[PDB]
Design a protein around this ligand. Structure first.
Ligand SMILES: Cc1cc2nc3c(=O)[nH]c(=O)nc-3n(C[C@H](O)[C@H](O)[C@H](O)COP(=O)(O)OP(=O)(O)OC[C@H]3O[C@@H](n4cnc5c(N)ncnc54)[C@H](O)[C@@H]3O)c2cc1C
Ligand SMILES: Cc1cc2nc3c(=O)[nH]c(=O)nc-3n(C[C@H](O)[C@H](O)[C@H](O)COP(=O)(O)OP(=O)(O)OC[C@H]3O[C@@H](n4cnc5c(N)ncnc54)[C@H](O)[C@@H]3O)c2cc1C
Ligand SMILES: N[C@@H](CCC(=O)N[C@H]1CSSC[C@H](NC(=O)CC[C@H](N)C(=O)O)C(=O)NCC(=O)NCCCNCCCCNC(=O)CNC1=O)C(=O)O
Ligand SMILES: N[C@@H](CCC(=O)N[C@H]1CSSC[C@H](NC(=O)CC[C@H](N)C(=O)O)C(=O)NCC(=O)NCCCNCCCCNC(=O)CNC1=O)C(=O)O
Lengths: 461, 461
């Protein structure tokens, strides 16, 4: 058995950062990677999505061309051109990552890890055993998919991965889900041409986002060409000769259920969830506890119930984002290897941007969460709704909405929620202020930048 | 003589805000406006510029169309279409402003004010006299133009105003100046098609901006098609039959001066400066002191040397921006009418964005200013330079550069300087943090938003 100081299972966002931080502090680590380095984000997440989103934003603006004094462009978009480019970028990123690892003296055990029966924690990668006084499970998660048992014909559809493997823009797309992935897949496909349908269980999407957002977003979708199928469910999927035939059920409360066929569907995309990547780890050999869905259970310091084993990222189920994974593995290394007894990530005021059209950005508490925490009496919220001046000359229109949630008498800014043009780059700073403890006064005592959409946040009233 | 509580001379950015604030606090004010309400910003500044900039950004992205899988568009841009639209927007804004005033019970004395001989401060608007225990001069400024005396043929060229009156994109443009206006006029014209030349007195532009910016910006200009004529000066301008003929002098230090003719110039734009709008006020009747250039002299509370007279905005010469004008008139009203003895605007950490391509955004001290204030020993600066992932698939390329200036041992973030895609919407938040007193630690303890250009600011190292 080879002994290292750190043995990180999983070369994705959290895995790598924790190993990098560790090696830079003097330790000897080894990332065990079973597939391609970079994890879900580089290979089938953040990176590919953004490229496709940038592209979607491009067809959009093409529509305001004439309005800006230029001749129109018909627009026969060629899927494969941007696909092949996107995939290249991904290769370049892989190489770059491999290099950085080796550059930092990080051994890469190339294969699939699983814990052994051995008393002291140990893992076996391809018939070989490795161990270390510190092992970090950072194996992430994967797409949740329905059962033929539950939904007959479920396996006929694809997921976000399958999406990133498509070599042709499907003519008829149907997406099932109401979260950021479902919302983004719906936006890219329909902006790029596909006749998209977003099948949601309720009346709106991003339901766990501040009411205003959940509302605005369901609307901008409709306004843009996405068909939101509310209170609908996929009963069964069938492969016809002309595509797929989806049997759906619309149970609009107050009305009688109605069965519907969506025929000639080219792409059926399941965007219902991410299940943890933990069973093939043989967690049961050590008794590393998990929840009923397989998520690995950890304390505020990412400690499993076993000594010398920790967990970070998607695998734990909390705050499924690359920066949260990174930030947790970075603080862990310091904890362990720099002896900082308290470096733990703070899970409050985490910023998130959803790349829908226009983009959403949000940090902090929703109004309801503020309310349930402070009490109606101690929660003031400021809002605004305007038309970016980009649309001052376009027939096409999107709007921008911003809401500030304030707590107590000082009006501590506990939550920022907005959707609109530029909201993607706009969030990070206010997130810093929101993280430092900013109050409304501080925001109002900042000279504005005119003309910009961001200036509307420091002049609310 | 009609007496009010507040008598504001000038209905622009600072004028209006101060009057609005005052009327909302119970006072009776009257904006004296000599032309169109909204001032320079609405009529010939912020508003028209941004529309033209949005347009310029549109021809730009048209170039990356094919690279994103779409067919190309030749691009015969029609100037007048966007011109007429831009002008309409401006009318709509005027109406909206007029309304707001009257809606807030603000009397609009429509004409040209000038102080009278009268002992107590008083002004005469069209043979009629008005007075008040508080008069605010907020008459702004105007384009500086060379003398036939100095530069023979100077009056042959136009300024930023003349620019906003052009009904046709000049084929050959020559811009003279090295500041944000000169830089923007150069960027809009050349992005929109005109064969532009930027005539600067030195080797770079935005010379008073952090070295990195001054440098990067001179480069992105060249890289984009703008011909930067360094160490050059306009000797004399002459009207030929084929356009204008500019006699220039290039005195590159270390070399011998060389005379040059730029012939067939369609547009000669003077972007050398803004002179104050004060002589027709008859300031001398009261002895309201000014500087040698006519700027009105005020204390930290915008107090002139006379009691009951104040000054705000461009007229004073300090921080020539709409938000600074606004912010000063807003704090003044409170001071005066809400009896807040100390509401004064803080002139440090003022944010500014220059709409060049890519956009610049900057707040706080430059490295040199940090240095001269703290000492080389106590100033650490972090930098980064990357390619936005928008260009991961485009042949065209622009880069993004960010520099953080830190002071003392805590590394108080005293200055943020960046240029790149999205830097326009990106600044406001960090400006708030920079204004609250953020240190590098605070920035590094903020979870990032991936993927974005703004995330690079909270992960510097
Ligand atoms: C579509 C889509 C879009 C997304 N968009 C964004 C975005 O824009 N920004 C950011 O929000 N986040 C985004 N995410 C989320 C982000 O991708 C994840 O939250 C992040 O990737 C998780 O980090 P992690 O370290 O836990 O996991 P992961 O990066 O998923 O990595 C786990 C790695 O370990 C490997 N592995 C697994 N088991 C073993 C084993 N037993 N032995 C060896 N190796 C093993 C895996 O193969 C993989 O390479 C997106 C996800 C999807 C899916
Ligand atoms: C091109 C160009 C681009 C700019 N871009 C930006 C930008 O993007 N953002 C922001 O940066 N700032 C911008 N500015 C600067 C901004 O326009 C000014 O700094 C702001 O307009 C100044 O406010 P102010 O109240 O002092 O003056 P002003 O708005 O200039 O207003 C003075 C008003 O008073 C009137 N007046 C003058 N004398 C009298 C009199 N005696 N009696 C009655 N009325 C009188 C004037 O006619 C005018 O209507 C720009 C300027 C130019 C020129
Ligand atoms: N900020 C976004 C949203 C659009 C926007 O900025 N609109 C401005 C552009 S006009 S360009 C003129 C410029 N406006 C600004 O700086 C706008 C920013 C902020 N809302 C404010 O309070 O000023 C100014 O000089 N203000 C001084 C003053 O007297 N201001 C008096 C108080 C504001 N008017 C009340 C708000 C609705 C009026 N909108 C309107 O009148 C219509 N539009 C506006 O006020 C963007 O840039 O796209
Ligand atoms: N942020 C800008 C700039 C471009 C960018 O974000 N590039 C990222 C996209 S790759 S998508 C993968 C994602 N990257 C990010 O989150 C990048 C953000 C920050 N620089 C960081 O420290 O991570 C991640 O999962 N990181 C975890 C980790 O192990 N990280 C180890 C430390 C970072 N690598 C060192 C910096 C150069 C490597 N660049 C590279 O490798 C090439 N590119 C990158 O790292 C944008 O979004 O356009």
């Amino acid at each position: 058995v080879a002994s290292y100081d750190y043995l990180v299972i999983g070369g994705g966002s959290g895995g790598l950062e924790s190993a990098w931080r560790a090696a830079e502090l003097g330790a000897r680590a080894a990332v065990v990677e079973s597939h391609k380095l970079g994890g879900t984000c580089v290979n089938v997440g953040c990176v590919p999505k953004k490229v496709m989103w940038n592209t979607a934003v491009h067809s959009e603006f093409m529509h305001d061309h004439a309005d800006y004094g230029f001749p129109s462009c018909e627009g026969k978009f060629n899927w494969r051109v941007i696909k092949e480019k996107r995939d290249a970028y991904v290769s370049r990123l892989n190489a770059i990552y491999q290099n950085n690892l080796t550059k930092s003296h990080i051994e890469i055990i190339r294969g699939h890890a699983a814990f052994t029966s051995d008393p002291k924690p140990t893992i076996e990668v391809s018939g070989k055993k490795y161990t270390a006084p510190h092992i970090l499970i950072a194996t992430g998660g994967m797409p949740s998919t329905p059962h033929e048992s539950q939904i007959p014909g479920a396996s006929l559809g694809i997921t976000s991965d399958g999406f990133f493997q498509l070599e042709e823009l499907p003519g008829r797309s149907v997406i099932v889900g109401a979260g950021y992935i479902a919302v983004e897949m719906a936006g890219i496909l329909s902006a790029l041409g596909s006749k998209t349908s977003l099948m949601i269980r309720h009346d709106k999407v991003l339901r766990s986002f501040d009411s205003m957002i959940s509302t605005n977003c369901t609307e901008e979708l409709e306004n843009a060409g996405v068909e939101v199928l509310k209170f609908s469910q996929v009963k069964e999927v069938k492969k016809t000769l002309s595509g797929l035939e989806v049997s759906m059920v619309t149970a609009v409360p107050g009305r009688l259920p109605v069965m519907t066929m969506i025929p000639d569907v080219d792409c059926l995309l399941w965007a219902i969830g991410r299940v943890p990547n933990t069973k093939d780890l043989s967690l049961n050999k050590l008794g590393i506890q998990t929840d009923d869905k397989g998520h690995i259970i950890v304390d505020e310091f990412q400690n499993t119930n076993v000594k010398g084993i920790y967990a970070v990222g998607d695998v734990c189920g909390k705050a499924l984002l690359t920066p949260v994974a990174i930030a947790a593995g970075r603080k862990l290394a310091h904890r362990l290897f720099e002896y900082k007894e308290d470096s733990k990530l703070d899970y409050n005021n985490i910023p998130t941007v959803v790349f829908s059209h226009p983009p959403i950005g949000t940090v902090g508490l929703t109004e309801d969460e503020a309310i349930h925490k402070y009490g109606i009496e101690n929660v003031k919220t400021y809002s605004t709704s305007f038309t970016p001046m980009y649309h001052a000359v376009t027939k096409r229109k999107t709007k921008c909405v911003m809401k500030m949630v304030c707590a107590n008498k000082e009006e501590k800014v506990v939550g920022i929620h907005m959707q609109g043009l530029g909201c993607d780059e706009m969030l990070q700073g206010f997130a810093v202020a929101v993280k430092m403890g900013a109050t409304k006064a501080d925001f109002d005592n900042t000279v504005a930048i005119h003309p910009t959409s961001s200036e509307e946040l420091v002049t609310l009233r």
